């Protein structure tokens, strides 16, 4: 019952006017398939994700690295109320999901800054593309854009995105990280220290159920650039739309982690199909519960009609998994009787909603099989529809749902979902305190774990750039979704007995070069205080993010620890497109490097750019 | 910006307004019919080795029997036909033929003066304006086939807007190399050699890539209502004869290479429909002039 | 009778046009590459490799510094390609040995049985010779595949490397150091469009034994085919060396394909090869054109056409879908000829499905008549009566690439300094077998506590002077490792004790024909075996005395038939734990007793 | 090496395959004959005081008596001629006229269906390809008179190859300044202004001196068999009218500036011998269309 009124291109179907493909043709070979309903496809698609997860992250390595990680966390002298202990099984599990999930989100932001940096460098020609090629598809417009900026990962197709994907951005596979963990041990009303040690070794049944239904979604900038360019008068508006999308994505990532730590089971996304499907009488029903989201989607396909309902994921505490419907596209029946097939979505709620709007507006042109295949492929595989006109339509709806004039607003729903989550944390903690005691309850529902950005998390860094023997590890400080005081610590472990490792922090003007020599233990590097707008004053200038670079010799690993002084820091209001174009920062200097081999004693400290000549950002002008 | 125009469409002089009544149109039609019979009689006279058929045709045309010592100009009909051609071209040419002479000559044969009962296709291509950005050179050469040469010396591709007027029915563009053309705010298509356009659609944008020059050949076709006796081949020959014989030498007048250019240029002007109506009558007069002069050279 | 459901279930599927079918493949190749070669391991071992290369005494202008980003990226690509190619040659040499052992039974099979298919004949031959691999199907080849033979994946190698480092008007030492750490945007684009192909000897035996009637002919055909493959691989590495962006294959399909009027265009651009292929499928008619990848002075990628099979329109308008071929140009041409001949009795789906599957997944069609014709055409294209004169095209590709290297460097040397150009376009990375490279040997044989690492010496596509060296890393502080080089007359045993440092073993000279004189006898290849206790890594290094050693002409069928070299002696081993001082040297087989190649006796 | 081609010679669309039998050829010839008589009858009636000649002519053509307050369309013969013209131009155009109706109309007059009685000369110059070295640039402009502008920016003289195909009979080359031209493996003659060539002789090599650009004007003559009633002036005029009237508006068809270009393009494609036969029948149909529509104009 929603009339967007957005202009949509006409879609030409592969099936034709008969609305059914001819047997043994080229069209029938290139038609979309149903990857969820077919067991052979779904059983497989689980196997590849498991192989991808175990290849990049090994359970044996993660078990071994537990002891060293605990020692590093202990050496971070946190307060008595904010201490994180990894000898507790529940805390260790939450750290594993948090560290993996944060690393993928951190890598995405690093690429976004580079793409923004590249766009600003070629601002003159990017403007020419936007105005001149007004009448063109989003994919074609983007393909021109990434070609002219001379940026890495030029390919925009799904195969190209998969090929040029880092090891850290692989989505986390929930069931893999929940393997071999003891669950459900009983102490039988014993408070002795030996019994308490046993109780901390295991986890509760709920946490195992939460882990088996978890799957992270991380969105690449090259996919994000398509909905931004559908309406882009200038390059600045292109940049603003990039920030609006990713700020919303980061907000949803924090909510997803909070769902694991609250103390309740996450519902599973599933599809209902008839027991014995009859030709020309079949119906499909899809219920999507995005773990990284504040809203859900229910899509029903009955014949040639498509109906959807967007429902709140908070407040459904009365014998139902669905809250109030915030947006109605028709009538959806969730009481349909049929077989129950579960799946994990690889797209966010806005993306799935964007496609179902386009599918509804193109239901008459497309066939029933095309609607099923295009929807299932996108939801389960993150594969964009092959129909170029349909794909361009979906990115127009993606822009509308993200822009300020969206039919549904997200700041209101994200705020409520936060309120619902921490209220449930108190209720679950209070109930468990009464039933079994405070000592056991603290073991199973830690207070320190609040959000992806609130919690004190560590992020390993991989380095591939070597400057005269010094490996370079880059960590992007910020942006932040909270205000308060934050600390950053750098841990360096090398093969040599004595080490000489340096750090460098790049701001808008000038950079700060420091030297430390303590290894195998955390070293505190930088302090920040960020205000209500998420902006920090660094050496007299307003910044949103900073660049951190570590230079080492014969390094094996470098880890960065972040923590807030106060537990559960408040959240800044989520940024939008209007406030992103209101103020303009510069990140061009983040690519500047230094050579520690040629560093002298006098170059250390905080030096502005004008103290150096053109190039040679390591040695000082005499 | 820089604008370019076809040479023949610039400053059409006003046409005459005198001999346009029903009687005058009858006289021009009668002259065409009688002159055609005269040229047919001359051919028959040569074949039969006798001057009898030519004498009968000349007496009907000239209202006097031919005489050997005289020069056989054509009589009063030839003089009247010559003066109406002068008056039709320009408004400054005086009308010296009395109306009583026109009516008398109109009664020699019974023909209808309907000048709008048929049609003829004219091939002059109207390019009202070509607007080009800076650092681009555009030259227009040709009237029957317009070749437009464009050279781009700028940093990026340029958008050249073509305006073919609202009068032409169809225009066909063929380029030396494939190029892309589209209307205002339509998506540009792939490079294609030949385009067929209706000028009423609107201004057309040509994207000009940087590099070797691109030449577009333009051919048009427009429909003008004419009498059924119209013959384009005879009119073109008559136009050259009248121009060579000094029938169009009036001050403040513009000259054209062909009758196709004259009628099309006079059509892309203020009061174009009324101007074309007079031009069609002039064409039928030139058709009679061509036939009568070839039979009776002077 | 049948319902017709099973026929549609076994029909070939389009693996390029289907976007679902392209995503799935790309993931598996990426997973396969990462499992066998890890980015973390290679980056961490960079320092160890750099010290190994420097410790080799190389004259100025002929030494490589992996401290440079471009030099390091080129080396890992070179080492991966060389290792896969080298492993195939050892497999081929073993297969030739088994055939020569049972020449009597092989001759009977080649003569008596001729009505069976190519696959059936190969299976009978493999069973008789008792080869290690006895499966000719696609699944069997995939199952019996070593770690090193996995094709290299382009984007995986180029992932996470700094691109576009800007220093302005600075000659300072620190600015030079930061400049060397990054890589140019051109090399990143080349690596994103690079995929390697290394064909197995089991796949080659079907073309080799489809018309052969003698064991000598079968062996000669096998050698002739692999001579072409190695030359094509050498071209592939040189293509990335010069400062040019390589073209990559694509398919053009209609924007809105119609049910009954659909056309497909395939443009294959084999990175390992001097020629490309253009194939068009309109209706039931297939048209192909073989073009030359060299030349291309104009903007169009295609050069002059060297083989015609119809009229192919490469200026068609439609969607462009990009892919990397897993087959060589000869294999692609072999199939497109058979498909053209059998276009009448195959449907549209079979024609597209069979073509796409072979190009993208190296899958032979299930049709028996199609397979037999394909291998008959494959043999013709690699024989002396081929419609394509290969030696001309590979030679012309070499000259074109060297010319491009010179003009690309000279163009840069004008735009920036000599030092900037050198670090971006090295002159020491010309050709795969010309360059100095290393081979990370693996060993699964242990004789009395000594792990055996085997290495194939040669064959040589270049002539001059060559040097070979070993680097041995062992957990023990003091060890004694032996190197044995086996020829025809006898073997040569040397003993060393130095560790964690390259050590030259063999000085060899090879003439124009590509044949060396090892102790008074002409040899075309030698076997090097290294024995170490509790070894962790053994690497063999090769280098030519002069930079860019001149080429040796590729050998055809008659060249291989004329000269016959025995390879049976490569099988025997020695036991270093039972060695004696008097047994350490160059000795011949008549000295040793029967069966004990360790003690002189 | 760069290639240059004539614009009108590209991608000739397939022509219709229906209405090409002997019975259909008679209908077109009858329509042309009856259309001409209609024009002469109208002129005769206009010059007289009676409408009887026009009444008889129109009644024969349209099968109904002319009437005041009626549009005077042309009747069934006009409809058949219009739809037949659409079918000939494109293979995608429908064939809706029954064969019985065509046979009935062909019985109105007695004429032979000979489409090969005589010949006509078509003046479009086919330049299939011009092959030039890398330093030079070549631009081909024109269809009836082809002007090729040749510029040599290199150090030395260049050699450019002209290929006029094998269909045309004679080609006359005239240059702005005297130039040299000779066949393959033939000595170059002295520089002269004009050359006469037989396109079957082979590709022609022209030496391009370094300096001012050289422009070569080419005119060619081709002979195509046509019925004796063929009139080029009437065919060309009818070609423009049908294009204006939208009879050639159909999907995936190339467009041509004149009938000369249309017939030469189909002649140079594969199965050109088979295609020109249909084009000639369409030419005679366009001749009838011009006479019939000029006699009875409609909106």
CSV table of N, CA, C and O in Angstrom, one decimal, chain D residues 3-87:
chain,number,residue,atom,x,y,z
D,3,UNK,N,41.7,1.2,-42.1
D,3,UNK,CA,40.7,0.9,-43.2
D,3,UNK,C,39.7,2.0,-43.2
D,3,UNK,O,39.2,2.5,-42.2
D,4,UNK,N,39.2,2.3,-44.4
D,4,UNK,CA,38.2,3.3,-44.7
D,4,UNK,C,37.2,2.7,-45.6
D,4,UNK,O,37.5,2.0,-46.6
D,5,UNK,N,35.9,3.0,-45.3
D,5,UNK,CA,34.8,2.4,-46.1
D,5,UNK,C,33.8,3.4,-46.4
D,5,UNK,O,33.7,4.5,-45.8
D,6,UNK,N,32.9,3.1,-47.4
D,6,UNK,CA,31.8,3.9,-47.8
D,6,UNK,C,30.7,3.8,-46.8
D,6,UNK,O,30.4,2.6,-46.3
D,7,UNK,N,30.0,4.9,-46.4
D,7,UNK,CA,29.0,4.8,-45.4
D,7,UNK,C,27.8,4.0,-45.9
D,7,UNK,O,27.2,3.2,-45.1
D,8,UNK,N,27.4,4.1,-47.1
D,8,UNK,CA,26.2,3.5,-47.6
D,8,UNK,C,26.4,2.0,-47.9
D,8,UNK,O,25.4,1.3,-48.1
D,9,UNK,N,27.6,1.5,-47.9
D,9,UNK,CA,27.9,0.1,-48.2
D,9,UNK,C,27.8,-0.8,-47.0
D,9,UNK,O,27.9,-2.1,-47.2
D,10,UNK,N,27.7,-0.3,-45.8
D,10,UNK,CA,27.7,-1.1,-44.6
D,10,UNK,C,26.3,-1.9,-44.4
D,10,UNK,O,25.3,-1.4,-45.0
D,11,UNK,N,26.4,-3.0,-43.8
D,11,UNK,CA,25.3,-3.8,-43.2
D,11,UNK,C,24.0,-3.7,-44.0
D,11,UNK,O,23.0,-3.1,-43.5
D,12,UNK,N,24.0,-4.2,-45.2
D,12,UNK,CA,22.7,-4.2,-46.0
D,12,UNK,C,21.7,-5.1,-45.3
D,12,UNK,O,22.0,-6.3,-45.1
D,13,UNK,N,20.5,-4.6,-45.0
D,13,UNK,CA,19.5,-5.4,-44.4
D,13,UNK,C,18.9,-6.4,-45.4
D,13,UNK,O,18.8,-6.1,-46.6
D,14,UNK,N,18.4,-7.5,-45.0
D,14,UNK,CA,17.7,-8.4,-45.9
D,14,UNK,C,16.5,-7.8,-46.5
D,14,UNK,O,15.7,-7.1,-45.8
D,15,UNK,N,16.2,-8.2,-47.7
D,15,UNK,CA,15.0,-7.7,-48.4
D,15,UNK,C,14.0,-8.8,-48.4
D,15,UNK,O,14.2,-9.9,-48.1
D,16,UNK,N,12.7,-8.4,-48.7
D,16,UNK,CA,11.6,-9.3,-48.7
D,16,UNK,C,11.8,-10.4,-49.7
D,16,UNK,O,12.4,-10.3,-50.7
D,17,UNK,N,11.1,-11.6,-49.3
D,17,UNK,CA,11.2,-12.8,-50.2
D,17,UNK,C,9.8,-13.1,-50.7
D,17,UNK,O,9.7,-14.2,-51.4
D,18,UNK,N,8.8,-12.4,-50.4
D,18,UNK,CA,7.4,-12.6,-50.9
D,18,UNK,C,7.1,-11.7,-52.1
D,18,UNK,O,7.8,-10.7,-52.4
D,19,UNK,N,6.0,-12.1,-52.8
D,19,UNK,CA,5.5,-11.3,-54.0
D,19,UNK,C,6.6,-11.2,-55.1
D,19,UNK,O,6.7,-10.1,-55.7
D,20,UNK,N,7.4,-12.2,-55.3
D,20,UNK,CA,8.4,-12.2,-56.3
D,20,UNK,C,8.1,-13.2,-57.4
D,20,UNK,O,9.0,-13.5,-58.2
D,21,UNK,N,6.9,-13.8,-57.5
D,21,UNK,CA,6.6,-14.8,-58.5
D,21,UNK,C,6.1,-14.1,-59.7
D,21,UNK,O,6.0,-12.9,-59.8
D,22,UNK,N,5.9,-14.9,-60.8
D,22,UNK,CA,5.4,-14.3,-62.1
D,22,UNK,C,4.1,-13.6,-61.9
D,22,UNK,O,3.9,-12.5,-62.5
D,23,UNK,N,3.2,-14.1,-61.2
D,23,UNK,CA,1.9,-13.5,-61.0
D,23,UNK,C,2.1,-12.1,-60.3
D,23,UNK,O,1.4,-11.2,-60.6
D,24,UNK,N,3.0,-12.1,-59.3
D,24,UNK,CA,3.2,-10.8,-58.6
D,24,UNK,C,3.9,-9.8,-59.5
D,24,UNK,O,3.6,-8.6,-59.3
D,25,UNK,N,4.8,-10.2,-60.3
D,25,UNK,CA,5.5,-9.3,-61.2
D,25,UNK,C,4.5,-8.7,-62.2
D,25,UNK,O,4.7,-7.5,-62.6
D,26,UNK,N,3.5,-9.5,-62.6
D,26,UNK,CA,2.5,-8.9,-63.5
D,26,UNK,C,1.7,-7.8,-62.8
D,26,UNK,O,1.4,-6.8,-63.4
D,27,UNK,N,1.4,-8.0,-61.5
D,27,UNK,CA,0.6,-7.0,-60.8
D,27,UNK,C,1.4,-5.6,-60.8
D,27,UNK,O,0.7,-4.6,-60.9
D,28,UNK,N,2.7,-5.7,-60.5
D,28,UNK,CA,3.4,-4.4,-60.4
D,28,UNK,C,3.5,-3.7,-61.8
D,28,UNK,O,3.3,-2.5,-61.9
D,29,UNK,N,3.7,-4.5,-62.8
D,29,UNK,CA,3.7,-3.9,-64.2
D,29,UNK,C,2.3,-3.4,-64.6
D,29,UNK,O,2.2,-2.3,-65.2
D,30,UNK,N,1.2,-4.1,-64.2
D,30,UNK,CA,-0.1,-3.6,-64.5
D,30,UNK,C,-0.3,-2.3,-63.7
D,30,UNK,O,-0.9,-1.3,-64.2
D,31,UNK,N,0.1,-2.3,-62.4
D,31,UNK,CA,-0.1,-1.1,-61.6
D,31,UNK,C,0.6,0.1,-62.2
D,31,UNK,O,0.1,1.2,-62.2
D,32,UNK,N,1.9,-0.1,-62.7
D,32,UNK,CA,2.6,1.0,-63.3
D,32,UNK,C,1.9,1.4,-64.6
D,32,UNK,O,1.8,2.7,-64.8
D,33,UNK,N,1.4,0.5,-65.4
D,33,UNK,CA,0.7,0.9,-66.6
D,33,UNK,C,-0.5,1.7,-66.3
D,33,UNK,O,-0.8,2.7,-67.0
D,34,UNK,N,-1.3,1.2,-65.4
D,34,UNK,CA,-2.6,1.9,-65.0
D,34,UNK,C,-2.4,3.2,-64.3
D,34,UNK,O,-3.2,4.1,-64.4
D,35,UNK,N,-1.3,3.3,-63.6
D,35,UNK,CA,-1.0,4.6,-62.9
D,35,UNK,C,-0.6,5.7,-63.9
D,35,UNK,O,-1.0,6.8,-63.8
D,36,UNK,N,0.2,5.3,-65.0
D,36,UNK,CA,0.5,6.3,-66.0
D,36,UNK,C,-0.7,6.7,-66.7
D,36,UNK,O,-0.9,7.9,-67.0
D,37,UNK,N,-1.6,5.8,-67.1
D,37,UNK,CA,-2.8,6.2,-67.8
D,37,UNK,C,-3.7,7.1,-67.0
D,37,UNK,O,-4.4,8.0,-67.5
D,38,UNK,N,-3.6,7.0,-65.6
D,38,UNK,CA,-4.4,7.8,-64.7
D,38,UNK,C,-3.9,9.3,-64.8
D,38,UNK,O,-4.7,10.2,-64.8
D,39,UNK,N,-2.6,9.4,-64.9
D,39,UNK,CA,-2.0,10.8,-65.0
D,39,UNK,C,-2.4,11.4,-66.3
D,39,UNK,O,-2.8,12.6,-66.4
D,40,UNK,N,-2.3,10.7,-67.5
D,40,UNK,CA,-2.6,11.3,-68.7
D,40,UNK,C,-4.1,11.6,-68.8
D,40,UNK,O,-4.5,12.6,-69.4
D,41,UNK,N,-5.0,10.7,-68.2
D,41,UNK,CA,-6.4,11.0,-68.2
D,41,UNK,C,-6.7,12.3,-67.4
D,41,UNK,O,-7.6,13.0,-67.9
D,42,UNK,N,-6.1,12.5,-66.3
D,42,UNK,CA,-6.3,13.7,-65.5
D,42,UNK,C,-5.9,14.9,-66.3
D,42,UNK,O,-6.6,15.9,-66.3
D,43,UNK,N,-4.8,14.9,-67.0
D,43,UNK,CA,-4.4,16.0,-67.8
D,43,UNK,C,-5.3,16.3,-69.0
D,43,UNK,O,-5.7,17.4,-69.3
D,44,UNK,N,-5.8,15.2,-69.6
D,44,UNK,CA,-6.8,15.3,-70.7
D,44,UNK,C,-8.1,15.9,-70.2
D,44,UNK,O,-8.7,16.8,-70.9
D,45,UNK,N,-8.6,15.5,-69.1
D,45,UNK,CA,-9.9,16.0,-68.6
D,45,UNK,C,-9.7,17.4,-68.1
D,45,UNK,O,-10.7,18.2,-68.3
D,46,UNK,N,-8.6,17.8,-67.5
D,46,UNK,CA,-8.3,19.2,-67.1
D,46,UNK,C,-8.3,20.1,-68.3
D,46,UNK,O,-8.8,21.2,-68.2
D,47,UNK,N,-7.8,19.7,-69.4
D,47,UNK,CA,-7.7,20.5,-70.6
D,47,UNK,C,-9.0,20.6,-71.4
D,47,UNK,O,-9.2,21.3,-72.3
D,48,UNK,N,-10.0,19.7,-71.0
D,48,UNK,CA,-11.3,19.7,-71.7
D,48,UNK,C,-12.4,20.2,-70.8
D,48,UNK,O,-12.2,20.6,-69.7
D,49,UNK,N,-13.7,20.1,-71.3
D,49,UNK,CA,-14.8,20.5,-70.5
D,49,UNK,C,-15.6,19.3,-69.9
D,49,UNK,O,-16.7,19.5,-69.4
D,50,UNK,N,-15.1,18.1,-70.0
D,50,UNK,CA,-15.7,16.9,-69.5
D,50,UNK,C,-14.8,16.1,-68.6
D,50,UNK,O,-13.6,16.1,-68.9
D,51,UNK,N,-15.4,15.4,-67.7
D,51,UNK,CA,-14.6,14.6,-66.7
D,51,UNK,C,-14.7,13.1,-67.1
D,51,UNK,O,-14.3,12.3,-66.3
D,52,UNK,N,-15.3,12.8,-68.3
D,52,UNK,CA,-15.4,11.4,-68.7
D,52,UNK,C,-14.1,10.6,-68.7
D,52,UNK,O,-14.1,9.5,-68.2
D,53,UNK,N,-13.0,11.1,-69.4
D,53,UNK,CA,-11.8,10.4,-69.4
D,53,UNK,C,-11.3,10.0,-68.0
D,53,UNK,O,-10.7,8.9,-67.8
D,54,UNK,N,-11.4,10.9,-67.0
D,54,UNK,CA,-10.9,10.6,-65.7
D,54,UNK,C,-11.8,9.7,-65.0
D,54,UNK,O,-11.3,8.8,-64.2
D,55,UNK,N,-13.1,9.7,-65.2
D,55,UNK,CA,-14.1,8.8,-64.6
D,55,UNK,C,-13.8,7.4,-65.1
D,55,UNK,O,-13.7,6.4,-64.2
D,56,UNK,N,-13.5,7.2,-66.3
D,56,UNK,CA,-13.2,5.8,-66.8
D,56,UNK,C,-11.9,5.3,-66.3
D,56,UNK,O,-11.7,4.1,-65.9
D,57,UNK,N,-10.9,6.2,-66.2
D,57,UNK,CA,-9.5,5.8,-65.8
D,57,UNK,C,-9.6,5.4,-64.3
D,57,UNK,O,-9.0,4.4,-63.9
D,58,UNK,N,-10.2,6.2,-63.5
D,58,UNK,CA,-10.3,6.0,-62.1
D,58,UNK,C,-11.1,4.7,-61.8
D,58,UNK,O,-10.8,4.0,-60.9
D,59,UNK,N,-12.2,4.5,-62.5
D,59,UNK,CA,-13.0,3.4,-62.3
D,59,UNK,C,-12.3,2.1,-62.6
D,59,UNK,O,-12.4,1.1,-61.8
D,60,UNK,N,-11.4,2.1,-63.6
D,60,UNK,CA,-10.6,0.9,-63.9
D,60,UNK,C,-9.6,0.7,-62.8
D,60,UNK,O,-9.3,-0.5,-62.4
D,61,UNK,N,-9.0,1.8,-62.3
D,61,UNK,CA,-7.9,1.6,-61.3
D,61,UNK,C,-8.5,1.2,-60.0
D,61,UNK,O,-7.9,0.4,-59.3
D,62,UNK,N,-9.6,1.9,-59.6
D,62,UNK,CA,-10.1,1.7,-58.2
D,62,UNK,C,-11.2,0.7,-58.0
D,62,UNK,O,-11.5,0.4,-56.9
D,63,UNK,N,-11.8,0.3,-59.1
D,63,UNK,CA,-13.0,-0.5,-59.1
D,63,UNK,C,-14.3,0.1,-58.5
D,63,UNK,O,-15.2,-0.6,-58.2
D,64,UNK,N,-14.3,1.4,-58.4
D,64,UNK,CA,-15.5,2.2,-58.0
D,64,UNK,C,-15.5,3.5,-58.7
D,64,UNK,O,-14.4,4.1,-59.0
D,65,UNK,N,-16.7,4.0,-59.0
D,65,UNK,CA,-16.8,5.3,-59.7
D,65,UNK,C,-16.4,6.4,-58.7
D,65,UNK,O,-16.7,6.3,-57.5
D,66,UNK,N,-15.8,7.4,-59.3
D,66,UNK,CA,-15.4,8.6,-58.4
D,66,UNK,C,-16.7,9.3,-57.9
D,66,UNK,O,-17.7,9.3,-58.6
D,67,UNK,N,-16.6,9.9,-56.8
D,67,UNK,CA,-17.7,10.5,-56.1
D,67,UNK,C,-17.3,11.9,-55.5
D,67,UNK,O,-16.2,12.0,-55.0
D,68,UNK,N,-18.1,12.9,-55.6
D,68,UNK,CA,-17.9,14.1,-54.9
D,68,UNK,C,-18.1,13.8,-53.4
D,68,UNK,O,-18.7,12.8,-53.0
D,69,UNK,N,-17.5,14.6,-52.6
D,69,UNK,CA,-17.5,14.5,-51.1
D,69,UNK,C,-16.8,13.2,-50.7
D,69,UNK,O,-17.0,12.7,-49.6
D,70,UNK,N,-15.9,12.6,-51.5
D,70,UNK,CA,-15.1,11.4,-51.2
D,70,UNK,C,-13.7,11.7,-51.4
D,70,UNK,O,-13.3,12.6,-52.2
D,71,UNK,N,-12.8,11.0,-50.7
D,71,UNK,CA,-11.4,11.3,-50.7
D,71,UNK,C,-10.6,10.9,-51.9
D,71,UNK,O,-9.5,11.4,-52.2
D,72,UNK,N,-11.2,10.0,-52.8
D,72,UNK,CA,-10.5,9.5,-54.0
D,72,UNK,C,-9.2,8.9,-53.7
D,72,UNK,O,-8.1,9.3,-54.1
D,73,UNK,N,-9.2,7.8,-52.8
D,73,UNK,CA,-8.0,7.2,-52.3
D,73,UNK,C,-7.3,6.4,-53.4
D,73,UNK,O,-6.0,6.6,-53.6
D,74,UNK,N,-8.0,5.6,-54.2
D,74,UNK,CA,-7.3,4.8,-55.2
D,74,UNK,C,-7.9,3.4,-55.1
D,74,UNK,O,-7.7,2.6,-56.1
D,75,UNK,N,-8.6,3.0,-54.1
D,75,UNK,CA,-9.2,1.7,-54.0
D,75,UNK,C,-8.3,0.6,-53.6
D,75,UNK,O,-7.3,0.8,-52.9
D,76,UNK,N,-8.7,-0.6,-54.0
D,76,UNK,CA,-8.0,-1.8,-53.5
D,76,UNK,C,-6.6,-1.9,-54.2
D,76,UNK,O,-5.7,-2.4,-53.5
D,77,UNK,N,-6.5,-1.4,-55.4
D,77,UNK,CA,-5.2,-1.4,-56.0
D,77,UNK,C,-4.2,-0.5,-55.3
D,77,UNK,O,-3.0,-0.9,-55.2
D,78,UNK,N,-4.6,0.6,-54.8
D,78,UNK,CA,-3.8,1.5,-54.0
D,78,UNK,C,-3.3,0.8,-52.7
D,78,UNK,O,-2.1,0.9,-52.3
D,79,UNK,N,-4.2,0.1,-52.1
D,79,UNK,CA,-3.8,-0.6,-50.8
D,79,UNK,C,-2.9,-1.8,-51.1
D,79,UNK,O,-1.9,-1.9,-50.4
D,80,UNK,N,-3.1,-2.5,-52.2
D,80,UNK,CA,-2.2,-3.6,-52.5
D,80,UNK,C,-0.8,-3.1,-52.9
D,80,UNK,O,0.2,-3.7,-52.4
D,81,UNK,N,-0.7,-2.0,-53.6
D,81,UNK,CA,0.6,-1.5,-54.0
D,81,UNK,C,1.3,-1.0,-52.8
D,81,UNK,O,2.6,-1.2,-52.7
D,82,UNK,N,0.6,-0.4,-51.8
D,82,UNK,CA,1.3,0.2,-50.7
D,82,UNK,C,1.9,-0.9,-49.8
D,82,UNK,O,3.0,-0.8,-49.3
D,83,UNK,N,1.1,-2.0,-49.6
D,83,UNK,CA,1.5,-3.1,-48.7
D,83,UNK,C,2.6,-3.9,-49.4
D,83,UNK,O,3.5,-4.5,-48.7
D,84,UNK,N,2.5,-4.0,-50.7
D,84,UNK,CA,3.6,-4.8,-51.5
D,84,UNK,C,4.9,-4.1,-51.4
D,84,UNK,O,6.0,-4.7,-51.2
D,85,UNK,N,4.9,-2.7,-51.4
D,85,UNK,CA,6.1,-1.9,-51.2
D,85,UNK,C,6.8,-2.2,-49.9
D,85,UNK,O,8.0,-2.3,-49.8
D,86,UNK,N,5.9,-2.3,-48.8
D,86,UNK,CA,6.5,-2.5,-47.5
D,86,UNK,C,7.2,-3.9,-47.4
D,86,UNK,O,8.2,-4.0,-46.8
D,87,UNK,N,6.6,-4.9,-48.1
D,87,UNK,CA,7.1,-6.2,-48.0
D,87,UNK,C,8.5,-6.3,-48.7
D,87,UNK,O,9.4,-7.0,-48.2
